């Protein structure tokens, strides 16, 4: 079978890459779109591993209808785990 | 970095194996949970590449609350997630 924990880590990896690129890049329009998609789908805002960048993402209107922390309760890494572990 | 394609393939494949386990394996508790979690989250039911079993999983109440299963392809929902439309 497909390796569970490796796929969950790849998706976090991928999300992190988008989240960073959303703020640091010369407007990666897709990176911003992707990052909204995740937040809405997972009811989510940022990462605990990227709490500096998550702040500015929050204020750029890429999170579900909340202000700063909060944030530590809105970790996407944890919602990604829960998706692959059959919770929610 | 990680490529969008290979990760989007992996996740479909992970789901597909959950969809199968939920039906063919008897006790498969986690497989059912995983399957419903995906359906609830992504808003979809089953897969085009598993249309027969999807019939069963719809009928086991593991989907959101039959003719229109083709419109609820849950593989597409996964692509939309990683591409950024959803």
């Amino acid at each position, epitope marked *: 079978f497909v390796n569970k924990d490796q796929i969950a880590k790849d998706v976090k990896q991928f999300y992190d890459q988008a989240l960073q690129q959303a703020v640091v890049d010369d407007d990666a329009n897709n990176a911003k779109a992707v990052v909204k998609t995740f937040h809405e789908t997972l009811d989510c805002c940022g990462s605990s591993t990227l709490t500096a960048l998550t702040t500015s993402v929050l204020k750029n209107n890429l999170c579900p209808s909340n202000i700063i922390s909060n944030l530590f309760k809105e970790d996407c890494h944890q919602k990604i785990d829960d998706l692959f572990s059959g919770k929610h | 970095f990680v490529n969008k394609d290979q990760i989007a393939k992996d996740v479909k494949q992970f789901y597909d194996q959950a969809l199968q386990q939920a039906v063919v394996d008897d006790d498969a508790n986690n497989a059912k949970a995983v399957v419903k979690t995906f359906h609830e989250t992504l808003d979809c039911c089953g897969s085009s590449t598993l249309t027969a079993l999807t019939t069963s999983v719809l*009928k086991n109440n593991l989907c959101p609350s039959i003719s229109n299963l083709f419109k609820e392809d849950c593989h597409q929902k996964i692509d939309d997630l990683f591409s950024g439309k959803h």
Partner: antibody
Amino acid sequence: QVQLQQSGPELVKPGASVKISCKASGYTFSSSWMNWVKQRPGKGLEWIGRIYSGDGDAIYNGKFKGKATLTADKSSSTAYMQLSSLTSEDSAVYFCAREGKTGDLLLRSWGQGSALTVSS
Amino acid sequence: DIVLTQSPASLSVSLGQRATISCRASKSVSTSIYSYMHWYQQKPGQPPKLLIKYASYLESGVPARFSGSGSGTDFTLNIHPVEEEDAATYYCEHSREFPFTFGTGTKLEIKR
């Protein structure tokens, strides 16, 4: 003990209809699928379709789509199968078989069959 | 539709001996984790009985002398050692997609 007792043999005139029946016991009919398979004398097995007893939703083999008609009856715990415009080569034994508790997609318990023979 | 070509059409096998039937699918019947091919036995005048499920798994209450193997399009069924009660027609069936279809059929004769 799971058993599926089927309707007796039947002689019917060409161009008529027959409603064969398959009564289920010893398992929860209401949330189970029931399949139907055709077998002509001295020949193989042909799958007709399967119906979900909980709400009568049925998936037909394209070959039997407009001819076969599956229906479920929870109270009786009975699946029915109806064939229109009967022809000499609808003569055959017709089986019913249940799937597992999930939708196994596998024919786990079979009735004895029903000998339908079409002749004027 | 998936076309199941069983072979041989029939075979005669002495008691105590091995009998191998094969089934070949027109396209693949396997996913990453499951081969959706099953074997049925039909004694005349009776309904068929499921013997092997998902290529290799013994349906409960079936002698271990029945075994199955294969993947993709190529599937084999082995009975060993053959017995009198194994006189029947053997059918392979896929459940990969709609419509379900059955194999051409293989008739086992028991040499005594």
